[PDB]
Amino acid sequence: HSEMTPREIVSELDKHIIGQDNAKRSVAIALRNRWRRMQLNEELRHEVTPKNILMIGPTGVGKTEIARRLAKLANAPFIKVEATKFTEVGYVGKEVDSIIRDLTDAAVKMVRVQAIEKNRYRAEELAEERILDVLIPPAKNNWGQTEQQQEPSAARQAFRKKLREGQLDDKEIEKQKARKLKIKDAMKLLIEEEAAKLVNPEELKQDAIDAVEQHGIVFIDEIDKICKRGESSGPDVSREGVQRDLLPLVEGCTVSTKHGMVKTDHILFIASGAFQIAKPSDLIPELQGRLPIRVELQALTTSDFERILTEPNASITVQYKALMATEGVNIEFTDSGIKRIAEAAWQVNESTENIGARRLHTVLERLMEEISYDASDLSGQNITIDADYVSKHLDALVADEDLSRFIL
Amino acid sequence: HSEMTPREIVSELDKHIIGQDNAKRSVAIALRNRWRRMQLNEELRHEVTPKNILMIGPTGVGKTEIARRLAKLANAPFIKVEATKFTEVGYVGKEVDSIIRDLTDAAVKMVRVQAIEKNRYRAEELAEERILDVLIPPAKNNWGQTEQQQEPSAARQAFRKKLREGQLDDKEIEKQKARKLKIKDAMKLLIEEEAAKLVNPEELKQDAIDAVEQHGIVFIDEIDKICKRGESSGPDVSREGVQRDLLPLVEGCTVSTKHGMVKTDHILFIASGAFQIAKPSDLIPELQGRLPIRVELQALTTSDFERILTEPNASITVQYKALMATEGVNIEFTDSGIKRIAEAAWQVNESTENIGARRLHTVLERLMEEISYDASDLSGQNITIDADYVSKHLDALVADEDLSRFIL
Amino acid sequence: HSEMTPREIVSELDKHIIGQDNAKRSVAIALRNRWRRMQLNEELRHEVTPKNILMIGPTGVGKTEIARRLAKLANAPFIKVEATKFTEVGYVGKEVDSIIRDLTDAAVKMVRVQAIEKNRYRAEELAEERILDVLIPPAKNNWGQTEQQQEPSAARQAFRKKLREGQLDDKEIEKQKARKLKIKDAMKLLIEEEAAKLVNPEELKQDAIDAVEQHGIVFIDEIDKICKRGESSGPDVSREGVQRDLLPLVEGCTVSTKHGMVKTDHILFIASGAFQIAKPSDLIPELQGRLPIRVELQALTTSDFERILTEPNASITVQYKALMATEGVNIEFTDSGIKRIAEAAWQVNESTENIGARRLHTVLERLMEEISYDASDLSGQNITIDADYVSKHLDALVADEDLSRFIL
Amino acid sequence: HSEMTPREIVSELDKHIIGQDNAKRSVAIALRNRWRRMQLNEELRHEVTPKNILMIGPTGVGKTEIARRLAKLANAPFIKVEATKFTEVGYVGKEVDSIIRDLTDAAVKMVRVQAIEKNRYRAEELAEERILDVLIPPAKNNWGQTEQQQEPSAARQAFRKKLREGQLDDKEIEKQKARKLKIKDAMKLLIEEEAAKLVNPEELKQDAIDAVEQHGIVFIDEIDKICKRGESSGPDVSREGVQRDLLPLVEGCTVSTKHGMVKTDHILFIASGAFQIAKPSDLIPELQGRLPIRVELQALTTSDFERILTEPNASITVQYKALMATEGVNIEFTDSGIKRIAEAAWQVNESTENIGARRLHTVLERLMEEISYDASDLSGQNITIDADYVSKHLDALVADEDLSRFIL
Numbered sequence A, B, C, D: 001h002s003e004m005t006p007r008e009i010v011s012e013l014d015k016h017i018i019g020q021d022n023a024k025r026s027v028a029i030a031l032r033n034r035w036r037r038m039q040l041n042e043e044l045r046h047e048v049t050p051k052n053i054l055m056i057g058p059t060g061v062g063k064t065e066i067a068r069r070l071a072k073l074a075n076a077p078f079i080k081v082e083a084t085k086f087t088e089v090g091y092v093g094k095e096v097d098s099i100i101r102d103l104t105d106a107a108v109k110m111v112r113v114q115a116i117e118k119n120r121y122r123a124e125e126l127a128e129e130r131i132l133d134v135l136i137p138p139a140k141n142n143w144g145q146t147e148q149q150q151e152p153s154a155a156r157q158a159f160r161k162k163l164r165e166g167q168l169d170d171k172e173i174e175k176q177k178a179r180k181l182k183i184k185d186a187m188k189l190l191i192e193e194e195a196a197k198l199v200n201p202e203e204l205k206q207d208a209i210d211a212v213e214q215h216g217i218v219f220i221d222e223i224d225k226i227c228k229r230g231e232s233s234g235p236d237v238s239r240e241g242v243q244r245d246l247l248p249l250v251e252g253c254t255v256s257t258k259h260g261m262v263k264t265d266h267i268l269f270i271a272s273g274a275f276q277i278a279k280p281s282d283l284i285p286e287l288q289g290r291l292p293i294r295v296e297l298q299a300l301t302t303s304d305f306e307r308i309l310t311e312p313n314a315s316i317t318v319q320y321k322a323l324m325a326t327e328g329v330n331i332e333f334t335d336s337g338i339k340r341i342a343e344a345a346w347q348v349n350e351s352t353e354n355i356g357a358r359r360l361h362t363v364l365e366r367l368m369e370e371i372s373y374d375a376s377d378l379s380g381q382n383i384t385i386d387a388d389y390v391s392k393h394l395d396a397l398v399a400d401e402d403l404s405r406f407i408l
C-alpha cells in the first residue's frame, strides 16, 4: 500500500523506537517488498512470498514495538500471539488457525471503526437535514432552481446556525421512527440512523479478508520457547508440534473464519526469540526456510534509556506532562532529572531481574505517584522534577533490593 | 483432465524442480492414470484405484515441490498435512477427517477464485451497459433492427471510449441500488452485482466436491514419524493409531464436509518420509498396500544448488532481479557469483545442520540485505553480483559457525 | 432382499475371492438368514437377531474383501471401523455411535448416487423437452389427438434427431430461469434442473434409515486389539471399555443421526481379528454371546497368489491390461510370468514382513513401473510380460532385503 | 398402566426366563407398585418413590432378560447402560445425564413407531378414497342421503375390490401432489401424507416424556465395577465419582432432553453386579439407600440349560425350526439331542470360561452351521437332530479346549 522507501520507513520508525536500526531496516525491507510485488506480472506475483523475519534479542528492547509501529505505519492488520499458547494443545488448547481468525476479527474491528471516521460527517451533513426538515417542513414539492432549496439558507441557514449547540427542544421524525422525542436524542438517534445506509456488508467484511491476505502481520512472540532443549523429550515433541502446526500458516494455506476463507500465502510473519537456551537452527528445517531474515537487537543502555524517556513522540515523559496539564499543573524535567530516572531504572534491572525498557514505566510511575495524587490541589503551579526530586523519591526504593522486587 | 503423456508431465515438472527424475516419473504415471481410468468401462472404473506414492528422501530436496507442481499442473486441489499433527489427538486433536475437510475448503477457495476469472470480463462488459444507460438513457422501445441499438454506437461509443479512463463522475443507478453514488463507485459496485448474478452458487460448491473426489491430492508429510520405534511403547500405540485413523481415507470412505459429502476413493495420496529411524516396511500392512509406489529422492549436490538458483522458472535469482527492477535497478549474477552462493549454502549445511535447498534462500537473502535496502536510492544503476561481492558479504558469516546457526 | 441361496451367494463371492470357502459360507448363511427372517410371523421377527460373525485369520487373506463383496452383493450399506479407533476415548476420541452415523452418512451417499441413476434418463426424456419447446414453440393450446404432439415428430423429430450432438446455439428458457444462455449449458442446466422434481425428501433420507436398520453391515477390524493382554492393566480397562461401548450396538439399541433415529437390532456385524496375542474367549462374555459365528481363514499360498493374480474379475493383472490398452498397448502375461510374480511376492513376505496378498499389488506395480511410463511411446505394440521380463525387473529388488523394506 | 398382580407378572415372565423366581418376584412388586401409587392421594403420590432393585448374580443367568421382559411387559421405555462407561469421563466421557437422554430418544423411537401402528389402517382407509376419487370422480355436490354416497358402493365397490391386488396403473392426484404418478406409487405416496396428517406431532413427543417419567426403566449393568477396591486409589475416586454422578438420577432430579425437560423421580432403576470383588455395602451410602431391594440370582444348571433351550416362547430351538421351515425343511430335536446340546454348553463353560446361558447360542449355532447352509438344497425333507448328530458335530470341538476358546 504505502509507497514509502525503506529509508523513509526506517525514518518514520525512528519516531517511536530508539536505536535497533538493523531490525528497523529488516522490517522496512519487508514492507517495501510488498509494494515491489504488486509491480510485477501474473506469474511472479504468486511465486514471490513474504520474507519472514526472525528477531533475536533480550526482553523489552523494541521487538514488538518495531512490529507494531511497522504494522500501524502501513495501516495493516496486526496480531501478536505467544508461541507457547499452543504447547498445551496436546492435552487441549487453542488451535493455531485462531491466529488467522483473530488477525481477522481485529482486521474487522479495524475496518469497522475506520468506517465510522469516513461516516461521521455524512450523518452530520446529508443527515442533519432530518431535524431541519421538522424545523421548517419543506415546501409541497420543492420547485427547482438548484438554489431554491438553498434560498432559506436565510430561514434555513438560521436554523442550522442556531443548531451550533442549542437543542433539547422535543419534536419528532421518522421502521423509520415516527416516535416523538427530544433532540439531545432525535439528533443523536440520527447519527447512527443515517450512517448504516452508507456502509454496506459484502464489501466491508469482504475487505477485512482482502487486508489480512494482503497486509496481515503476525508476530509470534517467543518462538524460541518451542524449540528443542536437552532437558527432556516428551515436552519437545509437544514444542516441535507447535512448530509443525505453525508450518501451514507460513508455508501457505487456507483457514476458515466466520467472515470467509482467508489465504495466508502473503501474510508477513515476524517471529521473536531470546535464544539463550536454543538457537535459531534448533527450529525445524521447514521453519528456518520460511524465516529467511535474521536480525538481532542489542540490549538497551543507560543512554538508550535516557533517550527513550524523552525522544519518542508521546514518550512516557511527554504523556506525563500532558496528563498533569489536565490538572492545570505544569510539570518539567531537567536533563539531570531524566539522567537519574534512567539511572535508577538501569540499577534495578542490574541488581534484580532485567526487564529492559519496561522498568522505566514502573520507575517513572513510582516517582510521580505523589504529584499524580496531589495534582488537583496544585492547579496552576510549575512543578519541576529535577535530580533532587528524583533522588528523594527513588533512592531508598532502588537501594533496597527486596523492596525493589515488590515496588519497582 | 490433462491429456499429457507421463513424459510430457515430467517435462513440465522439469521447469520447477532440478533433478529427482525418478520421483517425477512416479508422480507422472499417477496423473496419467487418472486419465487412463476415465478411458475404461463402467466396472473397471470402480476397481482401479489411485496408485498412491511414498516418497523417501532427506529434507528440503524437492518432495513437496514435486507434489505441489504436479497438482498445480492438473489444477487439482492440494493439501499438505503433517502426520504427527494427529499424534496428540490421543489426548485431543484435529480429527484425521479434517484432512478431507480442509482439502475441500481450499478446493472451494479455489473453484470460487477461478470463478472470479470468467466473471471479470462479462462481469464488466454488461456492467458498462449499466453506467452507459444512465449517460444515454435508451429510447422508449428500442427498434428491433439489431443495429438500431448499435446506432450510438456513435453517441454511445463516445462514452464507452471516454470511459476508458476518464470517470469518477458522480451518477445514479439501480434491492438494486437507486442511490446516487459516483461513477468511479457505481462502476465498482457494478463489478460485484453483475458478477454475482453471473455465478451459479449451487453448481459452484458442488464443483469443489467434484474436484476433491476426482483430482484431490493429499500430501501426508513425515509419515515415517508415525511408524513404530524401539525407543518406547505408549507412543507407538498412538503413533500406530494415526495410521489406523488414516487407513479409511486411503482405502476409500465417506467424510462429512460443511459443503457436502465427499468420497476419498479416488483422492491421490503422496506420503513422505526421511526413513532414517523407521523403514517403509514399518508402516502397518494395510497402509503399505495402499502405497504401491516407492521412489527415492537423492540428496542435493552443489551443482544441483547452482542450477536451482537460476534454472527454474521464476527461480529465486530471477525473482530478485524482478524485484530490484521494480526499484529501477539492474541486478546481474555472474556465473562464478552464483557458483559461490551455492558453495556457501552447501558449506553451512555440511558445517551446521543440513536443511537441503532451503539453505539457498537464507544465504541469498543475507547476501542481498544490502542492495535490497539501498535499492530505491540506487535507481538507474547496473549492480552486478560477482564472486568478489558474494565473498565479501558471506565468507565471514559462513566461516563463523555459531553465527551461522543464528544468521543463516 | 436378494433371494440368493447360500450356495449361490458363495458362488457369486468366488468371483472376487480366492479360497477361504469357510468364511464364504459363514457370511453367506448370514445374508440368507435375513431373507429367512422376513418369511416369519410378527413375534419371531423381533426375536430373531443377526448371527454376527467373528472372522479369525492373518493379514490380507480376504477378510475385509469377503465382507465388502458380501455387502456389495446385497446392495447393503457397509462401514469398516478399526476397533482401536476408540481406545483413546478415555482421554477423548470418536464415540462408538459414530459407526451407526457413518453407516448412515454412507447409507445416504448411496441412496443419493443411486437416485441419480434412476434419474439420468428422466432429465433427458421428459425433460429434454425444455429446449425442443424453445426450438419449436408449441401451438397455442395443443389440440388433442394423442398423436398430434407426435405429429411433428417430422418438424419435431428433426430437432430431436439433430440434437444427437449438434448444439452450442444460444437461446433461453425458464425461480424457473428465463435467463438467456447457450445449450452446452441450457441443456445441462436442464439435467439437474429437471431431476430434483422427481426425487423427493422424506422418502430418500427416510429410506437410508430403512436400509441401515435392515441391511446394514458393520465390519469391526482388529477386534482382538481390544481384548485383555497380560502386559498391563490400565490399558486393558481402556480396551475392555471399547468392548462395553460396542456392546449396545450389537445387543440392540437406538442411536441418533442427523437423518433420524436408527435402530441397530438387525445390523449384521462381522468382527475381525488375528488372535495371535489374545483369543476370542478373551472377549467379554456379552460380546462372545453376540458373536455366535466363528470362522477361520487360512494364510495364502503361492498358488493362491497365482490365482489371485488372474482369476478374479477385474484382477490386478486384468486391470493392468485394460489400463495399458488405454495407451493403445497390448500387454500379455504368460503362465510362467505370473508364476514368478507370485513367487517374488511370496519371497518378500517370507524374508521380511508378511502382509498377505497386499504384497502382490506392490510387486506387480514395481514390475510394471517402466511400461506404465513408456506406455504412450509404445502405442500399437504387443508387449509380453514373461518369466524373463519378470526376473530382470524383480530379482535384484527381492534378493536385496533392506531394499525390499523400502521399495517392495 | 398394567393392572397385573405381581403373581400374574411373574407368570408372564416365566414365559421367557427359566427359574430366577426370586428376581421375578422382586421385579414384579416394583411394577405392581407403580399402579399402587396412582391409587393413592395427592400427597402420598410425591412421597412414594420407586423401590429400586440391585440384582446380584453371575454372568449370563437372566438379569438383563428379566428386566427387558419386565419393561416390554409394561410397554415401558428401557435403557441398559454399562456403569463403567463413565469411569473415563474423568478425562472426558459421556455425561451420566446421557442415560436419561437416550432413555428419551428410544422412548421416542418407541411412541413414534407405535404411532405408525394406529396410523397404518385409517392411514390407508382414507388413503383409498384418494385413488378412488380419481377412478370415479364424485358427483358435483353429493346428495346428502348418507347412502347416496355409498351408492357405487356399486361402481365404487368394483374399484375397491379390484384394488385388492390389481393396481400399479399410472394415475394422477393431489403442497398436495398434482403430479401424474402411477397408482402403485400414488398409493404409496398416499400411505405417508394421510398417515402424517393423522399424527398430532406435539402430543407425540410430549408423550415420550410422559413415558420416561412414568414408566422409565434404567438398567445400570455392572454397577459393582464402580465400587471401591483395595487394589489402588486413583481409580476409586473416579469409580466412586460415577456413583456420585448417578446419585441425582436415582434420588430425583431434572435433566435436559432435546425433546424437553424430564424428571427422574419415578424412573425405576434396576442395578446389576456380580459382586465377587466388591460387596453391595461398598456402594456409597446415599446409593444403598436408593437400592432398597436386593435379590440374588442363582447360577444356571444343565437342567436349566435344557429348559432354556426349548421351553421359552420363541426359544432358540423353536427359532431354528422356524428359520429352517422358511427353507421348507422340517427340523426336529429329540429329547436326548437337546440333553446333549446343553451338556456340551455346560462342558465348555466348566472347561474354559463360564459365560452362562450365552454359551447355548454358540454351541447351537456351531451345531447347525451344516444344515443352515444346505437348507435350500434339502427342501421338503425331515431332518432330525438327535444325540448321534449332536455328538458327531460337537464332541471333537468340545473336547479340544484351545479350539473351544476360538470356535465355541
Ligand SMILES: Nc1ncnc2c1ncn2[C@@H]1O[C@H](COP(=O)(O)OP(=O)(O)O)[C@@H](O)[C@H]1O
Binding pocket: A016, A017, A018, A019, A020, A058, A059, A060, A061, A062, A063, A064, A065, A066, A308, A312, A356, A357, A358
Ligand atoms: N528501542 C526502544 N525504543 C522505544 N521504546 C522501547 C524500546 N525498547 C523497548 N521499549 C519500550 O518497552 C516496552 C517493551 O516491549 P517491546 O518494545 O515490545 O519489546 P519486547 O518485545 O522485546 O518485549 C514497550 O512498551 C516500549 O515502549
Ligand SMILES: Nc1ncnc2c1ncn2[C@@H]1O[C@H](COP(=O)(O)OP(=O)(O)O)[C@@H](O)[C@H]1O
Binding pocket: A286, A289, B016, B017, B018, B019, B020, B058, B059, B060, B061, B062, B063, B064, B065, B066, B308, B312, B356, B357, B358
Ligand atoms: N530439486 C529441487 N528443485 C528445485 N527447488 C528445490 C528442490 N529441492 C528443494 N527445492 C526448494 O527448497 C524448498 C524445500 O521444500 P520442498 O521442495 O518441499 O522439499 P521437502 O519436502 O523435502 O522439504 C522448496 O521451496 C523448493 O523451492
Ligand SMILES: Nc1ncnc2c1ncn2[C@@H]1O[C@H](COP(=O)(O)OP(=O)(O)O)[C@@H](O)[C@H]1O
Binding pocket: C016, C017, C018, C019, C020, C058, C059, C060, C061, C062, C063, C064, C065, C066, C308, C312, C356, C357, C358
Ligand atoms: N483370498 C483372497 N482373494 C482375492 N483377493 C484377496 C484375498 N486375500 C487378500 N486379497 C487382496 O488383498 C487385500 C487385503 O485386504 P483384505 O482382503 O481385506 O484382507 P484383510 O482384511 O485380512 O487385510 C485386498 O485388497 C484383496 O484384493
Ligand SMILES: Nc1ncnc2c1ncn2[C@@H]1O[C@H](COP(=O)(O)OP(=O)(O)O)[C@@H](O)[C@H]1O
Binding pocket: C286, C289, D016, D017, D018, D019, D020, D058, D059, D060, D061, D062, D063, D064, D065, D066, D308, D312, D356, D357, D358
Ligand atoms: N434364566 C434364563 N432364562 C432364559 N434365558 C436366559 C436365562 N439366563 C440367560 N439367558 C439367555 O442368555 C443371554 C444372557 O443375557 P442376560 O439374560 O441378559 O443375563 P446377564 O445380564 O447376566 O448377562 C440372554 O440373551 C438370554 O436369552
